[model samples]
Target: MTREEARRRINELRDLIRYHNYRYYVLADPEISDAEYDRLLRELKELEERFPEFKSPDSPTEQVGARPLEPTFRPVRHPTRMYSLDNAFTYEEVLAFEERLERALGRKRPFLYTVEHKVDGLSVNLYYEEGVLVFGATRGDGEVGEEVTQNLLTIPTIPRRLKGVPDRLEVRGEVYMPIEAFLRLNEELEERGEKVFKNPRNAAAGSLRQKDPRVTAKRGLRATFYALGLGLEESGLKSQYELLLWLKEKGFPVEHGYEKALGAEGVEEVYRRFLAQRHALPFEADGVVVKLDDLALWRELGYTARAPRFALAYKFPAEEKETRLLDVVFQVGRTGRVTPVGVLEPVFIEGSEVSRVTLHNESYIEELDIRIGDWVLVHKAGGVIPEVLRVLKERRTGEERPIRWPETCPECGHRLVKEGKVHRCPNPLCPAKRFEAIRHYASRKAMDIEGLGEKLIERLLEKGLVRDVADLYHLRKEDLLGLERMGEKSAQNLLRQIEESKHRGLERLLYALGLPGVGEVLARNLARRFGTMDRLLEASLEELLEVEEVGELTARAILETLKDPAFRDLVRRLKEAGVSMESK
Candidate 1:
């Protein structure tokens, strides 16, 4: 298309997409499937790629700007300075804080501490003159901030006018979107095929900083006052707890979870209790801010370069924990990709105990210099799967052992192929690879073969009744009856579930095929784009690029798998066995 033609199409597409986005996100009602919505978006992107000049700054393809917001927002400087807080990661850090405060105060008696959940949200300064709302801004650089006065005015919890007048006041608070609101927003965005916010904190920050007040108003934002910025000395507040009470009396919203604690031990209890109830709260809180309850002591402790010496933010445990690296082993996947697994000393995090974590590949282990008997930090990568974060070399003992990288597949003893940082088993007949592939194919999001569980599958594999996933279609009721603890009735039920999985459609089958880098979401995208397995098999790398979310690496992986003779043979067998290859 010509530039003029592209411009016209781009504008039309933008308007249509923007209207649909509003209906889906703001109204919580959608008129199109995510696939259909993506096709339109891709069309616009394709046209704009051909004619770069037609790509608008306010393109509906942009995540934040696509909402009701302008390109620019005005700036506002705060009347009183905002301060950053020092952080404490452990009980040691907390202890150091108490020691520092005690040394500064020259007292041995316990000083009262006010513990408040550090709500993970954007900080803003709300100014009032003669009891009327005047200016509101973000805590940019802790001094000057972008004027979000109009956006701040949209939050219902923030009072437009103070009930009791202060000659001049600046209420420092956090602007946040509650968990429920965040969930709803993400649901709507997902339905409309848009990117969702990573967390509640990000959702709140993005909503609060919108250039359009109307958009912010629709975001269901909330706020709770925490500190006095301009008028604290004049208000005659003796302590931090008194400041909160005084603000509440004047009709300002203060967060309800703040509590008074005496001494370091009391503050420690408050922090522990809050961490236990963290997920139950309506808003996200990373940790607790322990402040000197006596306002005079804050002045006595004085200021540092940036933070107040009187207060310290006691941070919650990182998604990560440090533990001993017990051993390293390699596990071969359905595809030949062999990933290194880190066996760690059992540690409890996010409810369950994790004793094993994936090291990704051989290079990842080498890069981290991981050794058995060495201390390491482990965390749930992406807040889901447990993985090694880093090796703590400082705690290493001379007894630490080096890892022995495998030269062959552990299951079948076939020579492994090295590609970049990864080692792969080229043997299609490897029992371990076959079992994992079959198990993946039958998973809930894949073929969804209920009753075809891991233990039973293991029994079948051990009995040599099923060598490949395709062998599942050939199993008889009597074949299952020969296995340990398999009753005739259970065998019949298993066969029925296997029969039902044949109709799970192309998307599941594609995902079940265990192609490298092809996840359920991308498999669904492929199914929608190609309609049938035959078409997908025929697709070139360039053709795969046209599908949404399929980048160069993924496109290459898909093409490589589709062209493999062994994979083609499996597909033929599955097709012959009456497995559906077309999306329903």
Candidate 2:
């Protein structure tokens, strides 16, 4: 089609997909199936791919999935710190708020109370210019937050371009961890052997404040605008209710059912109503937000450094119950790290069943001295992860065993070595190392071996189809076809992929080696410095330490690995089989 036709089609598709997302996500009703909607999105994506530059920043297709976050969180300061709301949970507290309002005004007069759901979420601020969303930020420390604008742009709930808006805009909202989504995320985290967050608030906070936009992009996050504080004022919004109407006119999905309470009594009633019916809603809510509807009064009332004086948040109390710790079970990670988890008598926390809590590791176990059959104080720490509070030591019986750290490896029975806080088996041929090493070798970032992955590697190892990373290169097409999931055609494709990965960059090969602290970045550094496998292997510890990012500890590990005669022979065999190293 012509350029004009492509532009029109792209805009039409964007409208359809955005509408479908609103119906499916915000309304909890999907008229069309995910596959059908995806097909539409895919068509738009392909069109942009063919027409290359047709993909604009505001396109609906821009809401692509983000990359997973790193272990350390990067922080950024917001353009403006989103403030907290001074809250009133009790009925008397609400009355006191009203009394303060009346006394501050120096007269008894009727006031408007704008009641909205206290979104159980992190406070976020969105800034828009010329109808396009320019940036988003979190209320971090009431002074600064990480710049997560690019990541926040991926949320389907947010409008990339407001239909009708002024030159400048800033909106305040609550970024929430949707209940169903949060539970699924926790399950996925456990399966992946990653640390799960404590509650919706912490999860939302952590997800929003990630410095890397790619990290925040994955958490299935969504935001809702509550008030127009900055941009509306700049746009000359004199009427408080008009701002909400204008937001709706601009195609932002505004909270529909909130009522404007008549007076202070009504505000308190609204707070209680929201508190009582929280679970009935699809998303989590910690409390109710009470705001003065009159913009003049709100402006006159002003705010403290961290919270608005005219508004208050009435928070709900947590539902927590205790259960006895049944056992301290340690699960084996993909990398062979043993993590201790507390198996508890299933107790109710929040709206879900709490049967298990993570102990982190043996060090964590020692920190708490948690034992089997102890009456452990349990609570949903932030309504996310169920946590064991310090043990009820007064109630501990003699039956509680003094936990012992194993002297030998649990899987291989080989003596485990301790280096500071870490414990590892010295056996090079241990099953755990063999599995983890082969899997890492075939990983996307390492080797990019399409059909050779964790599950496939496990199957190959299980059937004795492969022995080591070197064994992968020796596999025949017929050998692959014999696997349960592999057909002749699939085997050929797998072999093709394996052939391509054989000559992958030296950095990839270096990373695939799976040295303890040698990551992709370090691998690149080594690859560049040495420029060849033989040079790297021959480098002395002193010579290796001279390289950037290579400390003595890492250099020592590298030198020690090269010293292993068996490992050296394995590398020699791999080199013989055309596993291209930097030297080639």
Candidate 3:
């Protein structure tokens, strides 16, 4: 290919890989094999190397972007060094934190545990790994964690390759879920009549700690790395700012858009900004995590057993805004749970934008009689889903009344059934579920879809262009060009990779389906046992159960899902599109 051709192809390849990053990183759904995706990336990298001028920092081929972290972080003693937050009131308490920090460095600072946002998400140690993402780990106890090695290999966001980084480094941040996702999850649990997790933090903590990564897959969790896990932490820019840039340059998914504060008033403003903007985005984060952004202050501040001493969280009071519920929007989750989202005039609670809040199950909504224009107060404290604080009786006009539930599901027009007090969408073939499901199937730890993202999928979904998994194969240059940023070479590369996705091994494809109970290992076992889609489809639930780790519920979800005409059609169409129908 000529220079023009290579440029185009590199762009195309990068786009595809980015999409796969979102799939693997945020959704845990993937549709292609790791080797296949790697091959696709490798070819792009080689081509880019062949055309030196065309090489860009954002290219997906380069791994590890910054230099390696220094052996020891700079000993930053604050002018008045930041003190650790206090704890010990409860198991996860602040008062206790104060006691512990005092034991280590004590009463000079005498400040309590600031109760910063303890994000329950993924953590990574980053510097410039070979000038890219070379190292990442969990917060074993602030200092070290078991090297997850190949397990981190399973994550796609931290970049197996990068363009800029230091010689040695490490950074940490909480990986978490978007609010809608957390709500969708709880809704699914309610539908299945299973116990529900209380909050996203618990969900993330459990998911990241799972012995079998497949357990991580069952929970739709994502991470945003933010701290310098291991690195030289000097002043001027501070560890907080430096690490943020490194993660961004290395293409690690980080929580961007932060405000720097000088004193307590400045701190309050920063907290307010994050609070208002919390729920509008795709991923989950409960509140603002405030750190003593200065490395020198942090050094003197030090830490307790679990958390940082220098940071203080000016938590958004909670999720609720004092506003009337205009109307509700139904959102579908990764597991196909259709839920009601409350819409209100954007409120400024906790300094960020708050428009829609979750009413949770229908029971909660019904209890509140939350209606259009009912000036209801909503609240989310310490990062829980925002709840109705109460009705603003004084502001309510007589016109305000209770909102009504639809007799049918808003998404699929399926007959809505009241499971106890909660209403559910019974149609298994709802269109809303299609994109969420397919995205989940193509995530990193699952199918390991090398290049794809939430934005690309949104565009694909918007044009009436894609509906099922097989539609990926149907994408063309023209289809891609219609989107805002796509160009010629990029389109061709992506199309070629889409064609190649068909050849991913069976276990990967199985896991990619995002089927509940059919965790990663189960998917692998199902594929290895049957060695093909045809045999697996024909096998009874009993036969599936005979495979190790296959339970009744798992078998039932697989068999029942496969039995669906819409789903089976997707499988058949994938085969027709030349997807390798046989297992590895």
In model 1, the Cα lDDT at residue 106 comes to 51
The deviation in Å at residue 315 for candidate 1 is: 8.2
- At residue 173, candidate 2 shows an lDDT of 71
Please, what are the lDDT tens digits per residue for candidate 1 over residues 38-119?
7787887888778877664445554442444232345666898899999988877777788777775655636788999887
Better of 1 and 2 by lDDT: 1
Model 2 lDDT per residue over 1-584, tens place: 89767765676675566556545543447699877888887898988888887775545566543222111223545555567778676867867887778866645535677777767777776766555564566666766655455456547677777755666677777677777777776656644445556567777877666655455657778777767755655666655566666666666656533667866778767767776776677677677777777776676786786778777877787566778988776554556554567888988876688888886555556667778878888865444456886688888877987655577767766566543354555444456778887878888888878787678887888888787788888785566646568777778888877778879877788888776567888888888888888887787989888888888877787777666665577678778888888822
Better-scoring candidate (lDDT), 1 or 3: 1
Off by over 4 Å in 3: 1-330, 342-357, 362-386, 390-408, 414-429, 444-448, 476-484
lDDT of 3 by residue, 1-584 (tens): 88867765676676556546535553558677756877677887788778988775445554422121111121222111112343221222322433444555533433422223445444434433333443344545434443332234334455555543444444455566556667677766666645455566665555555544444455566666665533444212445666566667767776545655544444455555655655555654545555555565566775566456666444433345576677777765544555668887777666667788776655556555567677878666224455565667667687875666677766766665443444554344577676676577567765545555777776787876777677777775455545647776567666766666777788888877665466788788778898898998798978978989887766776676677666677788878878886676
- Using TM-score as the measure, name the better of candidate 1 and candidate 2: 2
Best by TM-score: 2
What local distance difference test score does each model get? 0.76, 0.69, 0.58
Enumerate clash totals for all models, in the order shown: 0, 4, 94
Instruction: Write down the lDDT that model 3 would get.
Output: 0.58
Instruction: Tell me which of candidates 1 and 3 scores higher on TM-score.
Output: 1
What TM-score does model 1 achieve against the real structure?
A: 0.51
